[PDB]
Amino acid sequence: RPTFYRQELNKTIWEVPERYQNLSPVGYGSVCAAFDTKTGHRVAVKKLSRPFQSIIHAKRTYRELRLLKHMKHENVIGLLDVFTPARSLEEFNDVYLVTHLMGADLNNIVKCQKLTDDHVQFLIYQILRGLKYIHSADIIHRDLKPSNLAVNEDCELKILDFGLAHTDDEMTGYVATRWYRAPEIMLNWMHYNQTVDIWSVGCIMAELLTGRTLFPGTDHIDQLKLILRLVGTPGAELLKKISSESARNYIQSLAQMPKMNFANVFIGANPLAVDLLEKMLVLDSDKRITAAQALAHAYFAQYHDPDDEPVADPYDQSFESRDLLIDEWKSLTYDEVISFVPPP
Ligand SMILES: COC(=O)[C@@H](C)c1cc(OC)ccn1
Ligand SMILES: [Cl-]
Ligand SMILES: [Cl-]
Numbered sequence: 001r002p003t004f005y006r007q008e009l010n011k012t013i014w015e016v017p018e019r020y021q022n023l024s025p026v027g028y029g030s031v032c033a034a035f036d037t038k039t040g041h042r043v044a045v046k047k048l049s050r051p052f053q054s055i056i057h058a059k060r061t062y063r064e065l066r067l068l069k070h071m072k073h074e075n076v077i078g079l080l081d082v083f084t085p086a087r088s089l090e091e092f093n094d095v096y097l098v099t100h101l102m103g104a105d106l107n108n109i110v111k112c113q114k115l116t117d118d119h120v121q122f123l124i125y126q127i128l129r130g131l132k133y134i135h136s137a138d139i140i141h142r143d144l145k146p147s148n149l150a151v152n153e154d155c156e157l158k159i160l161d162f163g164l165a166h167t168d169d170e171m172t173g174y175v176a177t178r179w180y181r182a183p184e185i186m187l188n189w190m191h192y193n194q195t196v197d198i199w200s201v202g203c204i205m206a207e208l209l210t211g212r213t214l215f216p217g218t219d220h221i222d223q224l225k226l227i228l229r230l231v232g233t234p235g236a237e238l239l240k241k242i243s244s245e246s247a248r249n250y251i252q253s254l255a256q257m258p259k260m261n262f263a264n265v266f267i268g269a270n271p272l273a274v275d276l277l278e279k280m281l282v283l284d285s286d287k288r289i290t291a292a293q294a295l296a297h298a299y300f301a302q303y304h305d306p307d308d309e310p311v312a313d314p315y316d317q318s319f320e321s322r323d324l325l326i327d328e329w330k331s332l333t334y335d336e337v338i339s340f341v342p343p344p
């Protein structure tokens with residue numbers, strides 16, 4: 001066990017190992033920037049807020065720790081360390097998570113840069129490379145958007161901030177929290193799956209090509225109208241897959257519209273980029289291109305290497321259907337803190 005030291009920083013007590021120095025507040029938890037003397041990295045240290053206050057919160061704490069401990073890929077955020085100052089389960093209360101300190105996100109470049117087609121190729125390639133890995137473990141990210149993508153000076157990218165299961169108020173009105181969501185999840189049409197993440201990638205790629213949000217709806221219904229104008233209204237085949245009779249009735253109340261010509265929407269774009277967008281932005285999720293298929297599309301010919309696009313170790317999510325008491329979720333979390341082994 002390392003030696004810990006205590007300090008109060010902005011109304012919060014932080015008790016951390018001596019290896020972490022020069023803690024400075026930066027913003028579910030409070031976060032400090034620090035220098036990690038063991039690795040030489042600048043890190044983000046997050047102290048979880050009330051991690052075990054309810055059954056729901058305790059299970060969410062376990063879910064987050066399990067997911068971060070599993071992710072080991074160049075294009076996905078990983079876990080550098082996890083610690084508690086507690087010496088036993090009896091006194092266990094606080095959980096701290098340590099990751100690489102990230103600088104700019106894809107907003108801090110999409111708004112502030114001139115991107116060549118080569119830049120778009122490399123950024124989208126890296127998102128899809130990380131997504132192939134994520135999806136191979138049967139994980140769905142659910143919240144892909146520019147603020148959840150970290151990018152450095154060399155245009156290298158990492159996916160972060162996995163969806164841990166966003167509120168009703170957060171999805172309401174003219175908000176970026178909804179502009180990247182697939183229509184079947186935005187309107188609760190059907191049980192969703194990993195194909196929702198590919199819709200999000202299409203929305204991101206379009207914005208890198210044009211500099212503008214693809215579907216900036218003022219509310220759920222306005223956003224659906226923008227979507228259907230581009231991709232067309234559904235046919236009977238997709239309508240059969242929508243579970244709610246009212247939702248089907250609402251859709252059938254709209255006048256039918258054909259899919260638009262994407263070359264006349266994304267004026268001047270690389271024809272191979274236009275082709276890939278038509279394969280991602282498909283209303284019926286069953287018919288969208290997958291991450292593994294998209295990596296082999298000709299748009300990425302200069303970056304695709306099928307011997308350097310790895311998959312994940314199997315990920316057991318059976319805990320998600322398990323019913324446990326607060327202290328049982330807490331004990332499982334404690335076991336995962338104690339068993340952590342750092343990366344090389
Ligand atoms: C059974 O199939 C349908 O009802 C399809 C042809 C349909 C889709 C609509 O999307 C606006 C509106 C009206 N009718
Ligand atoms: Cl230490
Ligand atoms: Cl990382």
Ligand SMILES: [Cl-]
Pocket residue numbers: 084085086091092093094095
């Ligand atoms: Cl503690």
Ligand SMILES: [Cl-]
Pocket residue numbers: 145146147148176
């Ligand atoms: Cl965003």
Ligand SMILES: [Cl-]
Pocket residue numbers: 254255256
């Ligand atoms: Cl009509």
Ligand SMILES: [Mg+2]
Pocket residue numbers: 147148161
């Ligand atoms: Mg975020």
